Amino acid sequence: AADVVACGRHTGAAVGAFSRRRGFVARPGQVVAEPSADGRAVVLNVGLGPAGSATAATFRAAAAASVRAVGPARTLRLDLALADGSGVPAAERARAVAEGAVLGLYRYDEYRSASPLAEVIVATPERRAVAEGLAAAEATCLARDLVNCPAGTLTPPAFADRIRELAHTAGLDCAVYEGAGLTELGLTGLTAVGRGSAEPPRYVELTYDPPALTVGLVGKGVTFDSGGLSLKPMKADMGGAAAVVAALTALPRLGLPLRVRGHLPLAENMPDGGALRVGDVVRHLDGTTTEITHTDNEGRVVLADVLVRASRPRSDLVVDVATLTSAAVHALGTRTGALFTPDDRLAQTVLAASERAGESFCRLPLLAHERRNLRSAVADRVNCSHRHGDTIQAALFLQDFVAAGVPWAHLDIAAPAYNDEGPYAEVPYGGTGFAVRTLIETLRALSEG
Amino acid sequence: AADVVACGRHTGAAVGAFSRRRGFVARPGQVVAEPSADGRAVVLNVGLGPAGSATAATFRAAAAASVRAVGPARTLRLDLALADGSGVPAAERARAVAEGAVLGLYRYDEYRSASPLAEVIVATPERRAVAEGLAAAEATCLARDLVNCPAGTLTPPAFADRIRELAHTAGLDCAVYEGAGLTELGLTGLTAVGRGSAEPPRYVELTYDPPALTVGLVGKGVTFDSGGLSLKPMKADMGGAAAVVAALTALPRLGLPLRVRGHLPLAENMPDGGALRVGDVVRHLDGTTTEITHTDNEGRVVLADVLVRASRPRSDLVVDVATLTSAAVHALGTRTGALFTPDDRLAQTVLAASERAGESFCRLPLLAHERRNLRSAVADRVNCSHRHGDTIQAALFLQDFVAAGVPWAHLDIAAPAYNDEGPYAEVPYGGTGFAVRTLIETLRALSEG
Amino acid sequence: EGLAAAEATCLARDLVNCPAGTLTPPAFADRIRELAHTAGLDCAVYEGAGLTELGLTGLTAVGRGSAEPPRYVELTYDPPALTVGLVGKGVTFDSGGLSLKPMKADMGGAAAVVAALTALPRLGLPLRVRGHLPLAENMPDGGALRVGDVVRHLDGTTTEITHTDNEGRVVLADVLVRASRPRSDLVVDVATLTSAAVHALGTRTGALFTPDDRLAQTVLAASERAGESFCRLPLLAHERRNLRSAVADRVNCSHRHGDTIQAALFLQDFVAAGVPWAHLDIAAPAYNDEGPYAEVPYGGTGFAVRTLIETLRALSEG
Ligand SMILES: [Cl-]
Ligand SMILES: [Cl-]
Ligand SMILES: [Cl-]
């Protein structure tokens, strides 16, 4: 038997006298606990708001609120997806409730010294949708764990080792490049940025090959970013690599008819007697040059050569994900990512995917007039203009390295990848796993078309 | 009938199965609501922790937690003070529960556009203690209201008007000095600091004369402090005046055999074409001079002449209360006030009073070697050394103005007067009314001896 | 008695004044060994693999960025029925690490402890005293301690490094575990620990923390005899909330006001249950960067040497 049962209630739905006396008015995520009818167990009444305004995000948030209110129970049954009357179809309700339950239960206690809850059950006939939601949420929590991991544990070599182990679990193809084998690939930005650190850099390629469409995902894996010699105005700057790895791990379970390759440059950015210097010039894999005008804009320099490699003459589409710029957050706020692409059809695909996933993105323009801020007196471009517009300038910088004719999108997720404000809804303090579920929904949509 | 009854539970005390299933373990301030035995009402089980470790502060905090958990109820009965088994005597339990209930219910909604709770009842035979606690808490909430009030509403003239109205309610004697009548008193610091503002300064004396001991209380009433021309590194810098006024309003109800006089300089510190200048010299009521080296250290300059007036050849003791220095907070933190006095017996009286009231103070030394940091090249002293130790230097500065032989204490309450972190226990966000209850307990102790 | 106390103070002044390039952690350990030999104080110096064996994780983590390796020294006066442990912070150069400061004088606590120990054979107190001295540099480097790293201490508890400039408390943690382990009747630590202290206390007064009122009075009266200024600050229970971490058992920096009190509470966690303890935070008065006055020079002052000696004298009588 369930120790606790969570009942979804839209505004106007009947609850008992005790629930009314406690102030239950079905506000989204409001929870009031009471004894079960027979007095042997617990019932949670959980608000879903007005039936007419409810979305999948309402259900996701209500499930997370339910799991947070479980107390010392061993078993919890969520009946939330059985609540009908909203416009959210049964399968969408089931998927969202399953996701919210896993996301809301997430804890990162690995590094504390010194959970009665053994089973969460989602009630619904939509078993496929439950499975899909659990898998998406489990992938999100993998990314959360990677971001939360101290940089001393998750070094570039350790991260490469972890990716290899994850790949083995579905027999994703995995190649790890290190030392002389890495030098051979000509990823000059990665090796230049990574050299100051005592930890050597790594490059990992991770392939799902279950198709007619091949998608390349590029994820920024800076495991610790101190700003280098220039300083910042630090373990979470591998959030892009975390999102890409996690999305790839979810694909074998979903069984999408789509080939997907992950490209993952891993490094630390540290000050040191041998660190990358202001004024240095990097000669990239495509023969073009970048002048290092600020060592804290290292991400774009690392990604450059990987985008050349990923788009070389073959992937039909390349998507990069990176915690790239701080300028983004000033106008967009802390919970919204930035999307760049020249392809309007790809923009709509990514944006609709983010809406299904409950993740907030804003498309920003690849402004031609900001290219003047890439100009260098010495090299082909700079990595920092010291002027306003760095979020757009970084996107334009990356665009230079994507081979002619290859559709491309760039996701700048610096702010929403790490929550330094309190927990809310299904999102914890700290590493969030932001963009995992957007990526999965994007890949699902691309596989259909 | 009570809609809600709050039951105090020490660790190990019996609660029903539902309460156990919800995780009730009697942690201090933990609340679990359940149906009453007959199913017609609500019971709150409220944690009081181990009987052996419980203090009056435990009861105060539990009462505040209870009132926050009332929901939409019209009537609440707190049975918390009936819980025995701790070392806290019945009268102390009753006083603390009454205080915590009022303090925990506090809201400041005067300036919002657009409470079903009509009665809170404290169950106990200790009716005198309940009355004492309600009165102390009501005085605290008066101070909270004054601090929370926007500076545009609570100007120096408006504040003087409010004090006059409060005084009238018990026929405390009240004299308000303004314009030419104020100029006659020779409070040079007050008039110099206040001149930049469009609002004119005020000085108010408020006397409780129901005795053989006469106590003077001096409260800093800067209703808005911009830092003046020097700037800060702002409505809450009248927290000292608020505490003094509120303590005085509580005395007629308590009926202490003690004469108490309040001395309240009120002003704004603003930049302006006619504002106090760096390098200006103030000639005080005692003939000594102060050089203005920083216009943001205006509080000590305002208080100086009032301390001369208050201690002049008569008050047996003078206590000043002021939100004086920011340096305090760096080592003491945001919830602890600083106490200065040369009189060890007075220090113990104030500290024991603060312990009874549940307010945190630390005695700091009047360090003779910090007097060298008061030296000026032009006047008798400076108002700012630009060196470390300003909290101690400010206390030494004030000490200069207290007439020879008069016992004196100074309370620097800058940090705990305003809570800019979240609410906790019986303390809200914003104006706290800090030091009201310490002052009342100090005056009670002095009246006995 | 006065000449000996003053000579010990001047030893501490010399150690603090010494350039960090001369007084490296290995060089400091060598100097302590030589000083110990002069009265045959027992002296053990731990380095390399022998140091790793002691499990002083904070010391080895903080010290790793520097080209200079860390050292740990134990120095014992055993001439008694009372045994006192003294713990002295010996950061020979503190750059702030990767986080930066808002630098050779951050071994003033170790200097005071060493100097006090050297004075005991002359005075002949009937008291056993053990010094515990972690020595390291805090430097930025490709291999330096990172923000977000977690240190697992000798007692099994964990600390999250939220600011690399609060390295002193992290170094002291494991030494306090070792010094108070199941035996010393009392442990006193001395450290140039926090800058927040000085803001309200000024540049010539140290901060004293202890839960034991009788020990507080002993230390304060000793400081009065010695002519050194201390102020007792409270171990505020409500400041413990500022030690909370989202990842580890505690943080080394809250980024909030009250760091002097928070540092004392941090250290308190590592002192074994039931062992009386006091903490002296001497950051400001250990180095005089204002002019000379009275008996105090510009620069290294040897602050707390004479307070420690007077404290040990009082404890030896009772
Ligand atoms: Cl970048
Ligand atoms: Cl002031
Ligand atoms: Cl520290």
Binding site of B, by residue number, is 220, 225, 237, 296, 298
Tokens of C170: 């992290």
Q: Is C259 on the interface with B (CB under 8 A)?
A: yes
Q: Which residues pair with B122 in a beta bridge?
A: B78
Binding site of A for Mn(2+), by residue number, is 220, 225, 237, 296, 298
Q: Preceding residues of all breaks in chain C (C to N beyond 2.5 angstroms)?
A: 79, 102, 182
Among this protein's residues, is A235 annotated catalytic?
Answer: no
| Ligand closest in space to the Cα of A228 | 1
Give the integer Cα–Cα distance in Å for C236 and B333. 9
Any residues with CB less than 8 A from the CB of B166 and at least 6 apart, and which? B142, B172, B245, B249
Give the integer Cα–Cα distance in Å for A52 and C155. 56
Query: Which of C205, C242, C258 lies nearest to residue B332, judging by beta carbons?
Result: C258
DSSP assignment of B23-37 equals T----TT-EEEEE-T
Distance A398 CA to ligand 1 centre (A): 10
Q: Of B14, B19, B12, B11, which Cα lies nearest the Cα of B36?
A: B19
Tokens of C149: 């790293």
Give the integer Cα–Cα distance in Å for B92 and B276. 49
C129 in Cβ contact with C22 (< 8 Å): no
Q: Is A35 on the interface with B (CB under 8 A)?
A: yes
Give the integer Cα–Cα distance in Å for B360 and B333. 11
Any residues with CB less than 8 A from the CB of C234 and at least 6 apart, and which? B336, B360, B362, C209, C261
Give the integer Cα–Cα distance in Å for A361 and A351. 7
Tokens of C214: 């009788």
C-beta neighbour count of B215 within 10 angstroms = 23
Chain B, window 57-116: residues with a beta carbon less than 8 angstroms from a chain A beta carbon: 71-73
Give the integer Cα–Cα distance in Å for B164 and B175. 8
For C146, which DSSP code? P
CB–CB contact A73 B21 (8 Å)? yes
Q: How far is CA B38 from CA A34, B41, B42, B43, B435, in A?
A: 15, 8, 10, 11, 44
Residue keyed to tokens 């030419």: B180
Tokens of B127: 């009716």
By three-state DSSP, how is residue A286 classified? coil
Topology classification of domain C1-318: Aminopeptidase (3.40.630)
Give the integer Cα–Cα distance in Å for B15 and B18. 8
- In this structure, what are the phi and psi dihedrals at residue C77, rounded to the nearest 5 degrees? -95, 120
Give the integer Cα–Cα distance in Å for A109 and A121. 23
**Residue A379 identity (one-letter amino acid):** A
Query: Which of C143, C148, C248 lies nearest to residue A112, judging by beta carbons?
Result: C248
Give the integer Cα–Cα distance in Å for B382 and B361. 27
Q: Which chains touch C (3 or more CB pairs under 8 A)?
A: A, B
Any residues with CB less than 8 A from the CB of B344 and at least 6 apart, and which? none
Q: If you measure CA to CA, which chain C residue comes closest to B385?
A: C202
Give the integer Cα–Cα distance in Å for B288 and B279. 16
B97 in Cβ contact with B46 (< 8 Å): no
B110 in Cβ contact with A62 (< 8 Å): no
A193 in Cβ contact with A269 (< 8 Å): yes
CB–CB contact A3 B23 (8 Å)? no
Q: Encode A377-414: b = buried (16+ Cβ within 10 Å), e = exposed.
A: eebbbbbbbeeeebbbbbbbbbbbbbbeebbbbbbbbb
**Residue C146 identity (one-letter amino acid):** R
Query: Where is C45: in which H helix or E strand?
Result: strand C42-46
Separation in Å, CA of A158 to nearest CA in chain B: 39
Give the integer Cα–Cα distance in Å for C49 and C68. 15
- In this structure, what are the phi and psi dihedrals at residue A99, rounded to the nearest 5 degrees? -60, -50
Burial class from Cβ neighbours inside 10 Å (0-12, 13-18, 19+) for residue A184 reads exposed
**Residue B91 identity (one-letter amino acid):** A
For A116, which DSSP code? -
Tokens of B225: 């402090």
Any residues with CB less than 8 A from the CB of A37 and at least 6 apart, and which? A43
For C284, which DSSP code? T
DSSP assignment of B376-416 equals -SSSSEES--SSS-HHHHHHHHHHTTSPTT--EEEEE-TTT
Q: How far is CA C252 from CA A265, B250, B421, in A?
A: 31, 44, 20
Handedness of CA B241, B242, B246, B249 (dihedral sign): positive
Q: Encode B12-37: b = buried (16+ Cβ within 10 Å), e = exposed.
A: ebebbebbebbebebebbbbbbbbbe
By three-state DSSP, how is residue A39 classified? coil
CA neighbours closer than 13 Å in the CB half-sphere of residue C244:
7
CA neighbours closer than 13 Å in the CB half-sphere of residue C43:
20
| Domain B125-449 class in CATH | alpha beta
Q: Of A214, A208, A199, A128, which Cα lies nearest the Cα of A157?
A: A199
Query: Where is C253: in which H helix or E strand?
Result: none
Distance B394 CA to ligand 2 centre (A): 7
Give the integer Cα–Cα distance in Å for B214 and B219. 17
Distance A320 CA to ligand 1 centre (A): 13
DSSP assignment of A377-416 equals SSSSEES--SSS-HHHHHHHHHHTTSPTT--EEEEE-TTT
Distance C129 CA to ligand 1 centre (A): 56
Q: Where are the alpha helices (DSSP H) in chain C?
A: 2-17, 25-39, 48-52, 57-63, 108-123, 167-180, 196-201, 213-226, 259-268, 305-317
CA neighbours closer than 13 Å in the CB half-sphere of residue C198:
17
Q: Which residues pair with A338 in a beta bridge?
A: A362, A412
Distance of CA B188 to the CA centre of its chain: 26
Residue keyed to tokens 């928070």: C262
C158 in Cβ contact with C248 (< 8 Å): yes
Tokens of A70: 């479980």
Among this protein's residues, is C101 annotated catalytic?
Answer: yes
The arrangement of strands across the sheet holding B381-382 comes to B281-283, B289-291, B381-382
By three-state DSSP, how is residue C94 classified? strand
Query: Which of C144, C147, C158 lies nearest to residue A234, judging by beta carbons?
Result: C147
Any residues with CB less than 8 A from the CB of A180 and at least 6 apart, and which? none
Q: What angle do CA A361, A364, A365 make, to 5 degrees?
A: 155
Task: Tell me the resolution in Å.
Answer: 1.8
Q: Which residues pair with A225 in a beta bridge?
A: A269
Give the integer Cα–Cα distance in Å for C41 and A316. 76
Q: Encode B404-433: b = buried (16+ Cβ within 10 Å), e = exposed.
A: eebbbbbbbbbbbbbbeeeeebbbbebbbb
Q: Is B367 on the interface with C (CB under 8 A)?
A: yes
| Ligand closest in space to the Cα of A323 | 1
Handedness of CA B185, B190, B195, B199 (dihedral sign): negative
CA neighbours closer than 13 Å in the CB half-sphere of residue C45:
18
Q: Which residues pair with B78 in a beta bridge?
A: B6, B122
Contacts of C202 in chain B (CB under 8 A): 367, 369-370, 373, 387-389, 392-393
Antiparallel, parallel or unpaired: β C205-209 and C277-281: antiparallel
Residue keyed to tokens 């201490």: C153
Give the integer Cα–Cα distance in Å for A199 and A251. 31
C-beta neighbour count of B74 within 10 angstroms = 14
Any residues with CB less than 8 A from the CB of C118 and at least 6 apart, and which? C8, C11, C35, C38, C39, C41
Q: If you measure CA to CA, which chain B residue comes closest to A75?
A: B21
B139 in Cβ contact with B169 (< 8 Å): no
Any residues with CB less than 8 A from the CB of C82 and at least 6 apart, and which? C127, C128, C185, C186, C315, C316
Tokens of B441: 């307990």
Stated length of chain A: 449
Q: Where are the alpha helices (DSSP H) in A149-238?
A: 156-170, 179-183, 188-194
Give the integer Cα–Cα distance in Å for A264 and A207. 11
Q: If you measure CA to CA, which chain B residue comes closest to C293?
A: B369
User: Could you report how far apart the first and last alpha carbons of chain B are, in Å?
Assistant: 44
Which ranges in chain B are annotated with CATH 3.40.630.10? 125-449
Q: Which chains touch B (3 or more CB pairs under 8 A)?
A: A, C
Active-site pick, A20, A27, A127, A232: A232
Handedness of CA C181, C182, C184, C187 (dihedral sign): positive
Contacts of A18 in chain B (CB under 8 A): 35, 39, 42
For B427, which DSSP code? B
Tokens of B401: 């103005």
Contacts of A273 in chain C (CB under 8 A): 141-142
Known binding residue C74? Answer is no
Distance B391 CA to ligand 1 centre (A): 45
CB–CB contact B391 C238 (8 Å)? no
Query: Where is B165: in which H helix or E strand?
Result: helix B156-170
Tokens of B254: 């308590």
Query: Where is C190: in which H helix or E strand?
Result: strand C186-191
Handedness of CA C39, C41, C42, C48 (dihedral sign): negative
Tokens of B112: 């919002």
Q: Which residues pair with C230 in a beta bridge?
A: C206
Query: Which of B325, B389, B391 lies nearest to residue C203, judging by beta carbons?
Result: B389
B53 in Cβ contact with C237 (< 8 Å): no
Q: Encode A304-341: b = buried (16+ Cβ within 10 Å), e = exposed.
A: bbbbbbbbeeebebbbbbbbbbebbbeebeebbbbbbb
CB–CB contact A235 C158 (8 Å)? no
Active-site pick, C104, C130, C169, C250: C169
Q: How far is CA C220 from CA C111, C215, C273, C304, in A?
A: 20, 9, 24, 11
For C128, which DSSP code? E
Burial class from Cβ neighbours inside 10 Å (0-12, 13-18, 19+) for residue A186 reads middle
Any residues with CB less than 8 A from the CB of B62 and at least 6 apart, and which? B8, B28, B29, B46, B47, B48, B80, B97, B100
Q: If you measure CA to CA, which chain A residue comes closest to C99?
A: A226
Q: Of B243, B221, B225, B227, which Cα lies nearest the Cα of B235?
A: B225
Handedness of CA B79, B85, B86, B92 (dihedral sign): positive
Distance A418 CA to ligand 1 centre (A): 17
Query: Where is B154: in which H helix or E strand?
Result: none
Binding site of B for Mn(2+), by residue number, is 220, 225, 237, 296, 298
Binding site of A, by residue number, is 220, 225, 237, 296, 298
A400 in Cβ contact with A393 (< 8 Å): no
Burial class from Cβ neighbours inside 10 Å (0-12, 13-18, 19+) for residue B128 reads exposed
Contacts of B328 in chain C (CB under 8 A): 200
